[PDB]
Amino acid sequence: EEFDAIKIALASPDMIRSWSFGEVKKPETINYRTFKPERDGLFCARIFGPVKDYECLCGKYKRLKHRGVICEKCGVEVTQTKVRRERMGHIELASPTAHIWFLKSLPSRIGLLLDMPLRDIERVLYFESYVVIEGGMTNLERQQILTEEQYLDALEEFGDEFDAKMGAEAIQALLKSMDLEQECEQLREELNETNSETKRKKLTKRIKLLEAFVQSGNKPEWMILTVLPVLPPDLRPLVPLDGGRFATSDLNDLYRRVINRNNRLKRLLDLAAPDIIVRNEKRMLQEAVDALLDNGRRGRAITGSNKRPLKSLADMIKGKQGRFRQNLLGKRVDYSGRSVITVGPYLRLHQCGLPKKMALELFKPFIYGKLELRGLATTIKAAKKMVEREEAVVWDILDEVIREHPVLLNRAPTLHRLGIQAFEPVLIEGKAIQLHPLVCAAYNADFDGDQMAVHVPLTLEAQLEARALMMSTNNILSPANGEPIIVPSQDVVLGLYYMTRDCVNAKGEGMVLTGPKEAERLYRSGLASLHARVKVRITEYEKDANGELVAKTSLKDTTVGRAILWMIVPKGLPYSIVNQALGKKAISKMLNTCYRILGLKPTVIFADQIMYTGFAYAARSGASVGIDDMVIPEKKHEIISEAEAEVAEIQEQFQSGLVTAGERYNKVIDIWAAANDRVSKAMMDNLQTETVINRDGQEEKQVSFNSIYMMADSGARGSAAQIRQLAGMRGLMAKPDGSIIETPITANFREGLNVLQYFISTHGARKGLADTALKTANSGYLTRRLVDVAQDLVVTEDDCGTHEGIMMTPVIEGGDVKEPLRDRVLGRVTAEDVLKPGTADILVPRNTLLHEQWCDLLEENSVDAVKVRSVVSCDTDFGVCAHCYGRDLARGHIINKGEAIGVIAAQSIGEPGTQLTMAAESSIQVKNKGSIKLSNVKSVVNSSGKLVITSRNTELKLIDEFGRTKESYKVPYGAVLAKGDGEQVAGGETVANWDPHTMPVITEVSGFVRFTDMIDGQTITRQTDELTGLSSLVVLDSAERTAGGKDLRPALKIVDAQGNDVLIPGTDMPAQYFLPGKAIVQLEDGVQISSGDTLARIPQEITGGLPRVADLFEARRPKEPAILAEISGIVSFGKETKGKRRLVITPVDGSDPYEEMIPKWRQLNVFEGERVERGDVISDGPEAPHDILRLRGVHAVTRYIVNEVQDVYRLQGVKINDKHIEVIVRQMLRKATIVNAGSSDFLEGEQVEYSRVKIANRELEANGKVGATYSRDLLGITKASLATESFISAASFQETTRVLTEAAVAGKRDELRGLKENVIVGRLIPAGTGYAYHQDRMRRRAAG
Amino acid sequence: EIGRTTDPVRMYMREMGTVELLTREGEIDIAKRIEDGINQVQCSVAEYPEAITYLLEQYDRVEFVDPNAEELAREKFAELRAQYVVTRDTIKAKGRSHATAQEEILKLSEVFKQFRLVPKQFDYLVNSMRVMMDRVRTQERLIMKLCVEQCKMEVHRALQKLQQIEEETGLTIEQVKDINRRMSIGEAKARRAKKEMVEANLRLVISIAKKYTNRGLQFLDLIQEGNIGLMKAVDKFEYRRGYKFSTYATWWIRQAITRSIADQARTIRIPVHMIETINKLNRISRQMLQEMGREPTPEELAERMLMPEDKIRKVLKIAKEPISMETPIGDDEDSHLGDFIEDTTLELPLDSATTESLRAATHDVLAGLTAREAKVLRMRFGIDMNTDYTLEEVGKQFDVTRERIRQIEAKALRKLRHPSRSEVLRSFLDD
Ligand SMILES: [Mg+2]
Ligand SMILES: [Zn+2]
Ligand SMILES: [Zn+2]
Predict the structure, then answer these.
(1) Half-sphere exposure of B373 (CA within 13 A, CB side)
(2) Do residue B8 and residue A299 have CB atoms under 8 angstroms apart?
(3) CB nearest to A30's CB, from B202, B268, B317
(4) Which SUPFAM superfamilies does this one have (chain B)?
(5) Of A15, A508, A1236, B217, whose CB neighbour count within 10 A is largest?
């Protein structure tokens, strides 16, 4: 009953007989008149159990006197019926048959054991050729294929020592005879001599299989079937449909034909038939077994009677609609209901309206119980009749039952954890569920036909955790980012905007009021307007040093509306919150302030009161939308006519041939874009601030009260682009795929489009609509993969005690600051404090949570880089400590022990997926004033007094007065600079200049130039020009170089009059400027070149969407990867082979030379021996994460993935905390590979869990011995999720047959750690509430 | 050249294509050789006398008509018995295997061959030789092994068992071995002969089968069953009749194929005769439909088949075959018939609770009754105890009087009918 683990292994024939209760000999199912089962058929009562409870066929042994006693005459045992669901049978095959899973499922385990190619086993099994089991005589050997006539040739001669067989008997005889130990040792030896990489790895994997296969206790013989088990009847039922017909499962058919073929084979062998006939029967039996175990994998699927293939056992397990996903991970549920939703604005934040009928049905048994308690019904049947007739006492009882009982409301798809929330019910009439307006944003629900489902929690624990963990008043902050989710919206915002805004002289200027109550009394009596500018006496409260509320009274300048609103605001907040015209942002900020100052309860009450007031005053405003409200600029037609005439003249000018197609097209597009912008700006100018009012005298100008403008400003529903379409021009459109149509749409929706313009717009309309429709599925698949990778993460410890971290800086891409620190460090734990004695005397204590206060301190001291403890570096095994995580964003404190991080991270990343979509490079110009600080720069002065850079990686910054970086840039190689380091540059200045379509080799010195190892005709080409006669020398590469001029490497000697080269001080390098191929020197040999002149001119002439992030997380390799410098030292070319570019790095100090092949057509950035370090980029192109991890280290790859994922989300304005991406990366670096002989049982080339290696290594290092050396591997989402230490998790995920085969062969054992595992087996998950329970069981391991 | 044609049908046809047909001469040639092998084995069987003794004794024990000799049986076997008995004496006369005794044995076999024997007795006779052959071989393999490995030409010690084997058998080992190996050679010739016709006529089987293949079991099952039939036909064929082989073989092949297609091919196994009747029904319906131009009503169909209306109706309802649980009932291939079917065996939680409440209430009411009355009622109806004990057992246990138990039950019924006690039980009124 109670268990601890699940193990899988192969089944020996005697085991299969052990399961059995009897063997099935006839294919009959049931009798055609009396539908009782047949004697030994597939449904026999004797072997599978009795059909009807406690009654055998004859009934002589009855009345529960005989328990377990078998009635002999009818052979029917007298027990319960449920046994037909669990007893199994068996079938004894006449000829051994191969198990398809262990034969075809690649890499074909049978092939690995015997080391035979698959097609050879195929040809043996299908009786097409013989195989030699035992050649005692030296002529032949084992596993040699023998053709038909060749066997005759060998038999007739030799005979009597020659064992050859054919078919599955042969394969089983081969497996039975083969001794594992011998090959284990022999292959162990064989790897020790020669390691051809391919041969080495195949031998490693085969040795792995043999060693595991010996350990598990399996024997290879068992891969081939002799006894075959038969599934219990009630899992393949044959049931009578009401109409007299019968419904059956397909397994009945497959079993029947296996039995038929087997019986006929026995008959044939008994009858001494010719051999071709028995061979035929043997093949058909083998085929029937294959179709039973897995249909269609043997090529041709057996179709049923109808048209369609029969569905077999493997089909019952595998698919999206197999057992694992459809009946175990998620299942249909009692006590539940469903209906349409509707808005109830009178509700409080923790209530939901439930129809009377649904409530009466859901809570049925509770009602029965309390009807019996009060004595109103004697028995349960009376209670039924009381309920079905709906007597009044039933309604009283129901009202008493539902009170304090929460229910769960769900709306599919459930993208994130806020899609399920618990509410307290209020009974209503009608049939629609009433939902509180504020929670619609979380649900993503709109009231236009949606439906939601209702579930009832039953036990006391379920009720309590609905009230404590899930109640809607507990979820006000989002767990993805810290921002609140209760955010007032359309009507609320409109009401608050209208109530707060101010107007000129309208009723009641300059009165003086004794507080808000007089303001309300004035407004509602019609004596003043909501917009009057009035002077009101107001008392704020302010929280003291020790939390006391000091009261301060003053006389403020405000309006009537703001005074009335102030009555809602809880005491503790400043008046300045209310004293400006509130938009959407202002209201959300108001709620956030109230939360972080006062707590939870005041914010809940405040949020309600905001909603109520907003509705009330929005209604009283009476805002409406007429057609006169969409004003059109008086000068639109002038702009349109001017643009049309100008385009007409440019098109007329085209036919003079002055303008090509590209010129005309680009010019026309530019013209129309400019016209569009002018029209839009004129429309907004006329619309936004157009009201002229007399201020008791002359005229005044104020923002307008136009209703569409109100909906724009308030942020209620409109935007600028929509209004542009309503009143300006609709704009330019695009052809179906890329091209942008030439003539725009000049009309707007008030004016009305014509036929052709409407047809044009339809293209884009349909394209966008189909995009969303077919993008939802990709979003769903991505989030499923993410959830499955990182589910095992739970907070397990309190402090791993690690000293690692990630250094974090604000992101300064390009010119402007994308993200400050306070957004990027808030709520994380600082490790290895950064102190700055000196300018700032920076004190950051160890291990602190960065509150808002600490962040404010950081800002005022203005620090830029902070090292922060991070999940990817945590040292805990099988989890992460609380400290390395940080805040729990939804709650607001250090995260609690036992919470499921991984699911939260996967959900928060995958949720925004649906809304996510699908050259003046001359010089460097500083935007704002500051000071220049270069880093990693190799400079050389020229004669012009300009700084020339040769360093490959040169970075430009802008330090401000307080010492922060405001800009950063990448200085290209060989770019001329303007100013040196140290001086303050000015805004707008250009600091660098280089040739865009060229990489020039810049001179440092002067003198005479000698053209070395470069002959004309062999290396260069003569170029002759006209009368001017200017020639240019162009170096030809070895591709077209003649055979005689191949060893000539072009170079430029820089000699003086004597020829002697002065050596660089201190350094012994010879001045040998061997410029590589195609060093194009236009100036001929013997021409004086100035320092800083161009020697050669070699010219140098993005998915970004949902696929981009899917590829980032899957760790795919870009097609053209940049190459990185592995080892520091000297760099050179070597001897080319067939054109294989030969790259030799010999280390300056290291002795071993490292060689890299390079593709021919790829260019090389570096010329010759430089000081290139670990992972120094040498080619141009996208970078591969694998290389980043191997060379730079783990922190580098984390930073890379975080940044380039976050770009995709920032571009759409989606805010996600980086912590979740860090978690996924942690789960994605799980494995390591071993390169060493340690002290433990590891090997070359094994892949094992990093945690396992850490445990073994620390265990040995506690004993002196030296452990093995490892290197972490980076695996995609799918790989890493399929390689866990648990076959149930992987098997439920994907690729069921493969993982089940591997686990079965290796004899794995599942220890039930994850969440999916316990969910499947029906247990408490090890997270949250269940956590404590498991830890008790853990200490039970101490007493066992 | 094999393009990995995994299709078993291709492998079968490729294998069968090699053997080439031969007609009008081979069939006679192979039939002659088969009969020659059978005659050889019959002659050599008749050579062994103890088999004749055993068969004659078995005939005498048991006690079938019209023997093909080119109280009838008893009078025809009387003179054969007399001849055999007088031949035994001559074998005892001055020569164990004397030429005269051999000639008498030959004439006895010639007369014996003129009779007809049931094949099962022939097999029994062959096994009567096989058993003793195996016994003698088994008891002596060890002595041959030892003489070969140790002696290389104990001896007298091992000779005792060999002599005992001769005494038990009572005949020369050499003649026994001769007859046994002659059995083997004759049977081998017969078997190896029949293989040739069987491998020759596989194409005939293919044709006859494909005439039936139209959506029945499957092609290969039909082919294999036909091959069984062909083996039977080769057994039964006689060239003496002078007919072509195909004429005879086709009947057996059709019979085998049709009988199998009747036995198998349905989940619920309709017997053969019903299958024949359904086939008649369908053949009549087509013709009658084209004659009338519409579908036939069951009454008119009953008129044409000369069968009562109810019989026809019963056949029509029996005919239909079960429907697969995976048939997609939804237009979109997402939902299958299987999800749509309800489980009937289960009881309802409501009724379970009701039953428990009923048991409790009955116990409460019974506890209030008189102790002996309560235990009597429990004892009578088997309440709370595993089985119910009858009136006699209750009488012999408590009080021998039978009618006293009747009066006890009458009074108990009277008491519990009193309206006070029954009030709760009325709630279980509708059931
Ligand atoms: Mg909707
Ligand atoms: Zn019985
Ligand atoms: Zn940690």
Answers:
(1) 16
(2) no
(3) B268
(4) Sigma2 domain of RNA polymerase sigma factors, Sigma3 and sigma4 domains of RNA polymerase sigma factors
(5) A508
Number of Cβ atoms within 10 Å of the Cβ of A1244? 14
Smallest CA–CA distance, residue B12 to chain A, in Å, is 7
CATH of the domain at A987: 2.40.50.100
Cα separation of A1203 and A811, whole Å? 9
CA A249 to chain centre: 39
Select the residue of B326, B345, B354 nearest A250 (Cβ to Cβ).
B326
> In the structure encoding, which two tokens stand for residue B174, read together?
């050499």
Query: What are the tokens at B30?
Result: 């192979």
Residues of chain B found within 8 Å of residue A382, distances taken between Cβ atoms = 427
Residues 21-60 of B with CB under 8 A from A: none
Neighbouring-strand partners of residue A830: A868
- For this PDB entry, the determination method is cryo-EM
User: A88-98 and A224-230 as β-strands: parallel, antiparallel, unpaired?
Assistant: antiparallel
Best probe of the A interface among B224, B277, B359, B431, by most A CBs < 10 A, is B224
| CB of A350 closer than 8 Å to CB of B316 | no
Bridge partners for A1142 per DSSP: A1157
Phi-psi region of A1196 (alpha: psi -120 to 50; beta: other; left: phi over 0): alpha
Give the burial string for A1198-1228 (b: 16+ CB within 10 Å, else e). bbbbbeebbbbbeeeebebbbbbbbbbbbbb
How close is the Cα of A753 to the center of ligand 2, in Å? 87
Domain assignment of residue A935, given as a range = 922-994
Interface contact B1, partner A, CB < 8 A: no
A881 is in an annotated binding site: yes
Q: Which residue of A has its CA nearest to B231?
A: A273
Beta bridge partners of A948: A940, A976
What 3 state SS string does chain B have?
A: CCCCCCCHHHHHHHHHHCCCCCCCCHHHHHHHHHHHHHHHHHHHHHHCHHHHHHHHHHHHHHCCCCCCCCCHHHHHHHHHHHHHHHHHHHHHCCCCCCHHHHHHHHHHHHHHHCCCCCHHHHHHHHHHHHHHHHHHHHHHHHHHHHHHHHHCCCHHHHHHHHHHHHHHHCCCHHHHHHHHHHHHHHHHHHHHHHHHHHHHCHHHHHHHHHCCCCCCCCHHHHHHHHHHHHHHHHHHCCHHHCCCHHHHHHHHHHHHHHHHHHHCCCCCCCCHHHHHHHHHHHHHHHHHHHHHCCCCCHHHHHHHHCCCHHHHHHHHHHCCCCEECCCCCCCCCCCCHHHHCCCCCCCCHHHHHHHHHHHHHHHHHHHHCCHHHHHHHHHHHCCCCCCCCCHHHHHHHCCCCHHHHHHHHHHHHHHHCCCCCCCCHHHHCCC
A44 is in an annotated binding site: no
Check if the beta carbon of residue A283 is closer than 8 Å to that of residue B224.
Answer: no
Tell how far the Cα of A339 is from the centroid of ligand 1, in angstroms. Answer: 14
B386 touches chain A (CB under 8 A): yes
Interface check for B371 against chain A (CB to CB < 8 A): the answer is no
Do the chains contact at B269 and A32, CB–CB below 8 Å? yes
Sheet containing A549-559: give its strands across: A512-513, A533-543, A549-559
From chain B, pick out residues whose CB is under 8 angstroms from the CB of A261.
221
> Of A1293, A1289, A1279, A1301, nearest to A106 (Cα)?
A1301
Q: Where are the alpha helices (DSSP H) in A142-274?
A: 148-157, 168-177, 180-193, 197-216, 250-271
Question: Are B397 and B429 spatial neighbours (Cβ–Cβ below 8 Å)?
Answer: no
* Alpha carbons A1179 and A1121: distance in angstroms, whole number: 8
Strand order from edge to edge, sheet including A224-230: A20-23, A88-98, A224-230
Q: Is A628 annotated as a binding residue?
A: no
Q: Which residues of A touch B198 (CB under 8 A)?
A: 274, 277
